[PDB]
Amino acid sequence: MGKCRGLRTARKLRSHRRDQKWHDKQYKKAHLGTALKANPFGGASHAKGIVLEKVGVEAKQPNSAIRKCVRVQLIKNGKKITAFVPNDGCLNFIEENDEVLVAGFGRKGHAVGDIPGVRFKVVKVANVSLLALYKGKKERPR
Amino acid sequence: DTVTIRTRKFMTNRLLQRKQMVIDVLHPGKATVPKTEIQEKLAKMYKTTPDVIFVFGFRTHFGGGKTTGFGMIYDSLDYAKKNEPKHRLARHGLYEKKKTSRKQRKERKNRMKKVRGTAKANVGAG
Amino acid sequence: VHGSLARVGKVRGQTLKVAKQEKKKKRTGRAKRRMQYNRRFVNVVPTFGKKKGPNANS
Amino acid sequence: MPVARSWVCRKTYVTPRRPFEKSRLDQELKLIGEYGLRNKREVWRVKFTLAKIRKAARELLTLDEKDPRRLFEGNALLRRLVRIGVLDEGKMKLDYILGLKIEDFLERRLQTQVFKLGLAKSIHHARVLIRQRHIRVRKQVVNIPSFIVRLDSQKHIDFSLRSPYGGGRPGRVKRKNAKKGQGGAGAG
RNA sequence: UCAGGGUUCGAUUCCGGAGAGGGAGCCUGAGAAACGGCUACCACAUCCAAGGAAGGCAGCAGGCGCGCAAAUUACCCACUCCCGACCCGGGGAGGUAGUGACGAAAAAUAACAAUACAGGACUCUUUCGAGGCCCUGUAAUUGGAAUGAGUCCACUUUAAAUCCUUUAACGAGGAUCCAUUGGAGGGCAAGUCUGGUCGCAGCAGCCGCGGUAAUUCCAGCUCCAAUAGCGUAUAUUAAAGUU
C-alpha cells in the first residue's frame, strides 16, 4: 500500500521495478538463458532427426486409447525426443532409421490433451509431407 | 492522312550548333508512327533537308491516339557528327560499332601482363 | 474383434467407398456475392419467431 | 550493395477484430449488394480513408480558433472534400466533417455514376462496360471502376469513339455472323 | 505495436568505428602500421627431377561444409559518377536482363433479353375469380450482342534486346478458356440429414466426443467464412489495472 511519491524519488522507483520483474515466471526464463540451454531445439521452430523406435502410449483417464508415437534422435545435438503421428493409419508411412522433420505441439513446450509427456509432432517423412501422403497427392520414392 | 505533328517547349542552342524541342504526334486508329515519317514531316516544317534531323524517345499513352518524343536539328552534318553520341549516328549508317566481346578484351590484357618488351605475339594473334 | 488391438488404419480401411455425385460449376467473385445478396435480403418468406437457419434438415 | 531503387509503400485497409459478429456480417453484405462490389477488402478500403479524415479533423479541433496551423490545414481539408462532391459548399466547417458516412464516398465511384447517369441498365452492367474499354472521361479512355469523379469532371462521362456503341467498328461476333451468313449461299 | 502513459527491436542500402586465417614487425609516400604491398613465427595446404618454388573470395559469379533457413561461373560503360599525361583510355563501382507466393498497389472468372412457373403492391368483386406492375430463382432448354487470356505480323522501346503502351489477322455456350484453403456441440458464422465403426480406429489449443439408434471419428450430399489466396510451428506487441 505505501508507495513513495516525492519529486526526487526516481532512483527508488526505477530500481525497485527492476528488482521485482524477476518474480514474473515468463520474464525470468526469457532472460536467465537456462531455459535456452535446456530446450532440445536451440531456439528453432523445427528440427530434423532420425527414427529409432515406434511405440504406443496409453491415454490418461477418463478416456481409453493407444496413441501412436515415435522415438527420434536429433541431428544437430544427438539428443533424444518422442513425437506424435497425426491422422488415421499414418504410422504405416514412417518405417525405421530414416529422417523426419518435427515441430512443436502448439503450447510452447507443455504437453497437449490426453497424451502423457509428449511435447512434439511429426510433419515431414523422407522429404514428403504427411498431408500429401494421406490425401494421395504423392508417395514415398522407392 | 489524319497523322498530325506539333512542337512544344522549343529552344535554339548556339553552344551545340542545334535547335531542340519536344514533339507531339496525333494518330487516331493507327499503330505508332515510324521515325522516318516523323523526320521528313519536321524537314517540311523547318524547310531543311531531313539529313541533319535526329528524333528519339517516343512513348504512347493508354487508350492510344497520342504520343510524345524529343528531337534536334543541327546547323550542318559536320557539326552533327561531332556533337551527337555515337549510337544515334549508327541508327542510320554514319558510324560502325566494334565487334569484339568484353571477355576477349579482359583476357588479352591479363596475358600481356606476363611478358616484357615487344609483346605483340600476345596481341595480333594471341 | 478381428485381428489384434492397436492395429493402425482400421476404420479408414473398413469404410465403404463412394464416388462424387456433383456435375455443375459454381459462380466466382462478384457473381457469388450478387447471388448471396439476392437469396438473403430481396425475396424472403416469413415464419413464427423460432426462425430457421440456412441448412435445416428436419 | 547501394542501388538507385526506393522502398516506400503502405497498406490501404485494416481487418476487423471480431471475425464472426452477426451484426457486422449482414451490414457489409448489404453495402456489397447495393454498390456491386467484388469482396470484403473493397469495403474495408473505404472505411480506412474515412477513419484517417476524421482522425485529422479531431486533432485540428483541439487547437485555438485562428491558430495559424488550424487556419492553413483546415482550409485545405475542407477544399479537398468539396472538390470530389462529398461535402456541400454551403456548409464548409470542420464540425460537419464528423457527420460524414461511408455511403457518401461509395456514391462518387465511376461505376455508380455510369449506372445513375443512364449509360447502363444495372450496377452490375456498369462495371462490365467500364472494364471492357467502352467508356471515356473527358478525352481519356478509363478502365478502372473505383476511379473517383471530381465535381467539374462530372459532366464529361461518355462512350469511347472506337467502340461498337459510340460510333466505331462492329465487334468480332457481328462481323463473323454476317460473313458466314453470306457464305450460306456458297463460296464463303 | 500503441486511448493517454508505455513495451520490444535495430547484422542490413545514409553517417561514425573496426578487420582482411591468428599474433607481431616494416618499406614507400602528403596520407598506410596497407594485406588485389613485403618479412618472420603459429594453423592449414599446392607443385617437384626431393635440390627447390609458390599462397590468403568477410569483391562479383560459382563450389564444399553447416543447418529449419537464402538466386546466374549472363550482357554493357548508353545513364550516374570516379581515376590518369587525357574532349579520345579504364571501371563485376554502377546500370540491364534471369531466378523470386519476403512483402506492397490495381484487378477477370458473366452481362442482357424472351418464355413457363414463383413473391408482393394495386384495381374490379361480399367471398370465389380475373386484370395487373416491379423484383427472385431454376429446368426440359431458347436468342443475339460485348470482351481479354492465348496465338502472331509491324511500329515504338534500348548500348542491343525483352516487358509495358499502340495496331492489322485468328480466338467462348458452359458437359469449358472447369478457384482454392479450412470448417458445420460450445467459445464462434454454418446440419437435433443418410451410410460405416463400436472406449477400437481416431478427434480434441480449452471444456469435451467414441462402450451397437455418434449434432464431434471415416465418407456422400447440403451449408458457412475469407478469396488469388488459406492453414500450421516458433519469437514478439496489444488484450495485461496479470509489473
UniProtKB/Swiss-Prot annotation, chain A:
Subcellular location: Cytoplasm, Cytosol; Cytoplasm; Rough endoplasmic reticulum; Nucleus, Nucleolus
Changes after translation: Hydroxylation at Pro-62 affects translation termination efficiency.
Residues with the 3-hydroxyproline modification: 62
Keyword list, A-Z: Acetylation, Cytoplasm, Endoplasmic reticulum, Hydroxylation, Isopeptide bond, Nucleus, Ribonucleoprotein, Ribosomal protein, Ubl conjugation
Modified residues annotated as N6-succinyllysine in this record: 54
Keyword Endoplasmic reticulum: yes
Modified residues (N6-acetyllysine): 135
GO cellular component annotations of the record: cytosolic ribosome; nucleolus; rough endoplasmic reticulum; small ribosomal subunit
GO biological process: translation
Compositional bias segments (type: Basic residues): 1-20
Annotated region described as Disordered, given as residue ranges: 1-26
The keyword Transcription regulation appears for this protein: no
Major location category of this protein: cytoplasm
GO molecular function, a single term: structural constituent of ribosome
Glycyl lysine isopeptide (Lys-Gly) (interchain with G-Cter in SUMO2) crosslink site(s): 37
One Pfam family from the record: Ribosom_S12_S23
PROSITE patterns: RIBOSOMAL_S12
Family: Belongs to the universal ribosomal protein uS12 family.
Purpose of the protein: Component of the ribosome, a large ribonucleoprotein complex responsible for the synthesis of proteins in the cell. The small ribosomal subunit (SSU) binds messenger RNAs (mRNAs) and translates the encoded message by selecting cognate aminoacyl-transfer RNA (tRNA) molecules. The large subunit (LSU) contains the ribosomal catalytic site termed the peptidyl transferase center (PTC), which catalyzes the formation of peptide bonds, thereby polymerizing the amino acids delivered by tRNAs into a polypeptide chain.
Subunit structure: Component of the 40S small ribosomal subunit. Part of the small subunit (SSU) processome, composed of more than 70 proteins and the RNA chaperone small nucleolar RNA (snoRNA) U3.
Protein name stated in the entry: Small ribosomal subunit protein uS12
Naturally occurring in which organism (per UniProt): Oryctolagus cuniculus (Rabbit)
Gene name as annotated: RPS23
From Swiss-Prot, chain C:
Role, per record: Component of the 40S subunit of the ribosome. Contributes to the assembly and function of 40S ribosomal subunits.
Residue positions, PTM N6-succinyllysine: 50
Domain of life: Eukaryota
Species the sequence originates in: Oryctolagus cuniculus
Oligomer and partners: Component of the 40S subunit of the ribosome.
Compartment annotation: Cytoplasm; Nucleus
UniProt gene name: FAU
Protein name listed in UniProt: Small ribosomal subunit protein eS30
Curated annotation (Swiss-Prot), chain D:
S4 RNA-binding domain: residues covered: 108-182
UniProt key word Acetylation: yes
Cross-link (Glycyl lysine isopeptide (Lys-Gly) (interchain with G-Cter in SUMO2)): 93, 139
UniProt-annotated location(s): Cytoplasm; Nucleus, Nucleolus
InterPro entries per the UniProt record, alphabetical: Ribosomal_uS4, Ribosomal_uS4_CS, Ribosomal_uS4_euk/arc, Ribosomal_uS4_N, S4_RNA-bd, S4_RNA-bd_sf
Residues carrying N6-acetyllysine: 66, 116, 155
Region annotation Disordered: where it falls in the sequence: 162-188
Modification Phosphoserine, positions: 153, 163
UniProt-listed PROSITE patterns: RIBOSOMAL_S4, S4
SMART domains given in the database record: Ribosomal_S4, S4
Name the record gives this protein: Small ribosomal subunit protein uS4
Coiled coil, from the record: none
Biological processes annotated in GO: ribosomal small subunit biogenesis; translation
GO MF annotation terms: rRNA binding; structural constituent of ribosome
Native source organism of the sequence: Oryctolagus cuniculus (Rabbit)
The family this protein is said to belong to: Belongs to the universal ribosomal protein uS4 family.
Domain of life (superkingdom): Eukaryota
Record's keyword terms, sorted: Acetylation, Cytoplasm, Isopeptide bond, Nucleus, Phosphoprotein, Ribonucleoprotein, Ribosomal protein, RNA-binding, rRNA-binding, Ubl conjugation
